[model samples]
Target: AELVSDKALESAPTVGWASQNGFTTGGAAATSDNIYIVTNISEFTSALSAGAEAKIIQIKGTIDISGGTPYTDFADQKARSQINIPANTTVIGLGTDAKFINGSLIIDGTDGTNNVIIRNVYIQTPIDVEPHYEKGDGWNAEWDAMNITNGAHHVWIDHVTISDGNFTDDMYTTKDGETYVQHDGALDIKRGSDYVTISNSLIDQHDKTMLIGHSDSNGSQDKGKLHVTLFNNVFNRVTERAPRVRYGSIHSFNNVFKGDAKDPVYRYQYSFGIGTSGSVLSEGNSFTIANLSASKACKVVKKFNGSIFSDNGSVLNGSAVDLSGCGFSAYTSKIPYIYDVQPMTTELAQSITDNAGSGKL
Candidate 1:
């Protein structure tokens, strides 16, 4: 595999070139360490699938397909989960402003089977007004803006913005409805992933923003439980749970929750398996409920064991802060699985600017 250097990184074209000096421009190069900074990430997936890794895959520029035909290139010919980023490579977005115009960039990891880093890119998936079905043998399912499948480990998603366009009738009505499905989450770490961190980012969507678990179909034995951390971030108008962990020991603290007061009903906040035990530390965070609805507060449910909620403050007043069923105070005390207590204030929030929180304990 070739390693990209500053010389090659600087002269690379941003767009509109059919060929290089001797190399064809459109097709995939063999085992190349390329640094691509372009608007079309989807076009480069073939090369990416062909074992292309770089020290840094920087995304610079506005990739916006705001107004166009919804189903122009919405087919799932690539299975949405077929792209692979080799270990020790960094897919860094230019900054929080790096935006993905249209279509989804599905980083499959070919089954949670590797170690990779995807950071800094702002990815946007297609929004459908009416579900458009392609001709013959294929039904386009446009959900999961970024689907990270397989048993991927040591994954980091930070400083990014992921939002779906709009909901179509077929989106939720079909098996993987577009409206509810497309904007499900900015990151879906399925198929038994571990050691994952999602921090310092903006996750705005209609459903869960960050999920780390696999369903029964992926593997009942490996239902995603491990060391995960979500720190120092903001959640805006997220319809469902943020950082929803099906099975794992998660540490979520110092996050700002803004939007619908009753948002994130947390039905599966901490659904762990039997004989499983870990601590879910929710501390030093602020919650602002939407004035439109009081029923939109975050709900936490417990199937097997309880969760630990501490120092999570209330910002909005029109809505009632409900921590009653779980047996905890809004700003004090421990719950069913909690063992610590403290106040969550702006000054007390943990200062974790690094994407992985620098493994700070």
Candidate 2:
């Protein structure tokens, strides 16, 4: 497969599916027959539902999809949608700085899950992003920014930015709202999926974002393996009560964690190990707990075993880390600032400092 460059797509087919709903596209369209580009998210959805192979080029504005309800057809269907882009089809964001703002754009994998690439896009929402809860039971439960259910594999999510705003005040006041407890991960590759690589993206705002391996199956505890390589990213103001792995090994390396002082950085409620039920590994990563008054940083509860925690090489200015739950093989001291450097072993940690951090010039 040839690398799909930005310039290569210049002459490719462009479709504007918003014509029926009163939007226009002139000469700069691609050669694809169903080159539907639109301003409204609903129009795009409708066009797609009508058997159009859409290659959308959203303009610079907020396209709202909150009004469109979630459909099992788009999320868990057995056969792929007629409108689904074929394999090796690259979905490119129009401009280098194109942004999708204000509302949520939900992708329903009704045709079961297949591999596709979603790159160079910025997706943001107006609603308050919440933690992970039941599958379809929250404010955003009816909507998922990027949802791939029914067994997806070998998907690549790169160079995308997702912004989940703060939770609604009423949700906090009363537990009636879905925002009280919601799992709004930026990229959710759950439900018995494997070989998913989510790298070089900015996922922020949600309390707990980025989850793999769904434990939400029919009373089955261990579904399958979620081989994830979380590398070279930045997590800012994320709450400590966020997700820890239940099953499958999560290779967390060379990522910068900026957590909230009121809450700890990460809390591992489950144990880690190999075998059918395995452990997670944390290597050469940077974890910073800003506020001293915050509670625990990393906790290991029961059932989590045989995991290795060393060479995190992060900056700790605030509270202490609580690892009383799970066991750790080794851990290192704090490095004063983000710019400070030291002996590097893990490839991820070294890459982050060298190419991702502020030092990248």
Candidate 3:
């Protein structure tokens, strides 16, 4: 009584960075440290603190990080309950039901923590409260569900679901004469982080979805660094920067971008923002826009500073559109790593939507 057929096993191809890099024992299987199965916050925190010897932290149930804590103080709110994932670790959810709600995961490599894998988890909210800009302290709140920062390298974020805590711009307002922002970001890879891969994940319903580099001024550390790969992911109803990148050689292939035209909270901008000194090589990607106006349909890549993005074999709105007119230069020569060619752009969205997020375990 074989569960998997011989034909099915024969047709399976190697996927993801681990397989590409010849990692025979990937994720939890690669660990020799104690396997910590967590269902609550305390166990979760303890497992993360377990010394860096290739640990496997498996989440079984919903771990609500915002529970029992007052959602207060826009000033330095993220520092209050930030969970740091140590280096040489694999953090995976048991199944589709495992979730982390209303807290942030900070994968900091400032101490040289690298080689991490995060898979099959749902990270929601992280921060739900509005900004209290009326305090006249010029307070601004910024947080992400997952932040890979401080030169973190060799990291993989796969098969996860990340979203805003249901906070939209229409839901919050500032006392001062400032505009309201929904969430800072869903996932951010910044501050000189390099050799990262984000694949088969769902970034849903957020304003600022993903940011690769921290700032335009941080080019000293960012230029010639921040090498990243985004593949087979779904960006659903996100406004802008389905990873707006800066100072990186980024490869985005076979991803889906679904725009929301009727979003009353924020204006739907372009899908990719190419920032200062960034080289984005987009191939076999699909963009399905909700509104097909001439202004909106052509707004695929937005440029800033001195950045350049190249698009090849991309589809828009069920038709093959010429993305070359968008002023993107060729960048395949700048990619540092080797990767498999993706499927057609026409099939990206449906394929990604069906299998991108966790739960299939």
Model 1: per-residue Cα lDDT over 215-313, one tens digit each: 434446344344565656666556554655555556665666655534443222221121123235565555654443345343432323324343243
lDDT tens readout by residue for model 2, 1-361: 2223433243211111111122122212334544444455555455345232324343323444443433244233112111232322334454455455434433333453333445566666333333334657544433335654444444555456665544422234335554454334555555554444444566555554554444534215235445555556656554421224444455544455545444432322321222233334444345554443324444212223224344334333322234434345442322111232333334444455344311121
Candidate 3, 1-361: lDDT as tens digits: 1111111111102443333333312234334345667888888888777645656777777897756576676543555567888876777777667788878888898887677778788888565466435355454456778898888777777788887645555676664566654356788888888777778888877777788887999988887767777888888878888878889777888888887566675457888888888878888888887765644555888888645777877787777667676776667554434667665655557867899876643
lDDT of 1 at 315: 28
Error of 3 at 333 (Å): 2.4
Q: State the weakest 10-residue window (summed lDDT) of model 3.
A: 3-12
Among residues 3 or more apart in sequence or in different chains, the pairs in candidate 3 whose N, CA or C atoms overlap within 3 Å are: none
| Candidate No. with top TM-score | 3
Model 2 lDDT, residue 342, Cα: 37
- The weakest ten consecutive residues by lDDT in model 2 span 12-21
For every model shown, what is its TM-score relative to the native structure?
A: 0.61, 0.58, 0.86
Q: In candidate 1, how many Å is residue 190 off?
A: 1.4
